[PDB]
Design a protein around this ligand. Structure first.
Ligand SMILES: O=C(O)CNC(=O)c1c(O)n(OCC2CC2)c2ccccc2c1=O
Ligand SMILES: [Zn+2]
Length: 339
């Protein structure tokens, strides 16, 4: 039990969720702390780059009223990236890297459309009873209607801007809106930026793994379109190819409306929209991490070693003139020499 006992909602409305809405996996977890932003422990966790769920930021307070109808009326007439998938797992592909690996075609199609088309496409699926799932993921721009601009202005910019200043982070790079169907799964991956994951509607089970568990999670090659994702099928883990997955230990939480999960830079995260929980809405805030310090302190952090491993794969990819020779060169380098 990583998320703990399901939290009770105000007004004696009882269980927000129950454990049968969670998917079953083979690894143990422990709870990410649920704290208040006023708690000095929450401050220590963020500076030390450990995950924390803040319960009372009011970061996206004006957005707590968002649903499909309100958004459809006010978000405007931009294009929204909608990812499709025949299964519940939404594996993403770097379309630019799809050239290096000709021997693969994607399984989660992206399709640009207008917001009203996505809403029509969604309740079509619920009435046809079909198995197809959709996931709208669109960076917020200024092509957005007046009432949503007002809501944006209503975010707690005082709090998050001071968090950016106190941690030495870079600038805010994007505000990703995510709207998803129940049961949708974003499979385990890590990002290179600091993330405040602000939950708006519905419930999302977030399972995180620290950077020192690189060896248990087996990311794709840097040049692979699925760069930064685990190769391990959490529903059917191949212990023969991925034996250290038997040693993986996660940090787990379930975020609901009003909650803000800090996902530290380089922390693995597996996110799922709770089964039979309806649609989920999230806004993400991405900050570039703080610049690498003056004097390098040893021993290195785990995330610096990941960054080192990424640079070696990149450097080899361009030195050899072909990303596909990285593998054989690296094996030639270690076989009988370092293993
Ligand atoms: O689904 C959830 O609740 C959590 N989603 C994520 O964590 C998530 C992510 O971090 N990235 O990388 C973006 C970084 C480059 C700026 C993606 C990229 C392409 C397509 C999908 C995603 C994605 O879903
Ligand atoms: Zn991510």
């Amino acid at each position: 039990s990583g998320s703990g006992e399901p939290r009770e909602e105000a007004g004696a409305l009882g269980p927000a969720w129950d454990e049968s809405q969670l998917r079953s996996y083979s690894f143990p977890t422990r709870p990410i702390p649920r704290l208040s932003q006023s708690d000095p422990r929450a401050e220590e966790l963020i500076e030390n780059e450990e995950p924390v769920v803040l319960t009372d930021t009011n970061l996206v307070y004006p957005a707590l009223k968002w649903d499909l109808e309100y958004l459809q009326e006010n978000i405007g007439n931009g294009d929204f990236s909608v990812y499709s998938a025949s299964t519940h797992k939404f594996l993403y592909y770097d379309e630019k890297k799809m050239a290096n690996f000709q021997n693969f075609k994607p399984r989660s199609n992206r399709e640009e459309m207008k917001f009203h088309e996505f809403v029509e496409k969604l309740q079509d699926i619920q009435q046809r009873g079909g198995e197809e799932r959709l996931y709208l993921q669109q960076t917020l721009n200024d092509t957005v209607g007046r009432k949503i601009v007002m809501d944006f202005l209503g975010f707690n910019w005082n709090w998050i801007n001071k968090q950016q200043g106190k941690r030495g982070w870079g600038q805010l790079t994007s505000n990703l809106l995510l709207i998803g169907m129940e049961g949708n799964v974003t499979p385990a991956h890590y990002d290179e930026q600091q993330n405040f994951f602000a939950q708006i509607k519905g419930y999302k089970r977030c399972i995180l793994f620290p950077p020192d568990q690189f060896e248990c999670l087996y990311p794709y090659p840097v040049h692979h379109p699925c760069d930064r994702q685990s190769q391990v099928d959490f529903d059917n883990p191949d212990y023969e190819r991925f034996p250290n997955f038997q040693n993986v230990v996660g940090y787990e939480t379930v975020v609901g409306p009003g909650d803000v999960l800090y996902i530290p830079m380089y922390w693995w995260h597996h996110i799922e929209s709770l089964l039979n929980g309806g649609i989920t809405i999230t806004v993400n805030f991405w900050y570039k991490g703080a610049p690498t310090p003056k004097r390098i302190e040893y021993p290195l952090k785990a995330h610096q070693k990941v960054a080192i491993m990424r640079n070696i794969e990149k450097m080899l990819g361009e030195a050899l003139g072909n990303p596909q020779e990285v593998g054989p060169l690296l094996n030639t380098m270690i076989k009988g020499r370092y293993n």
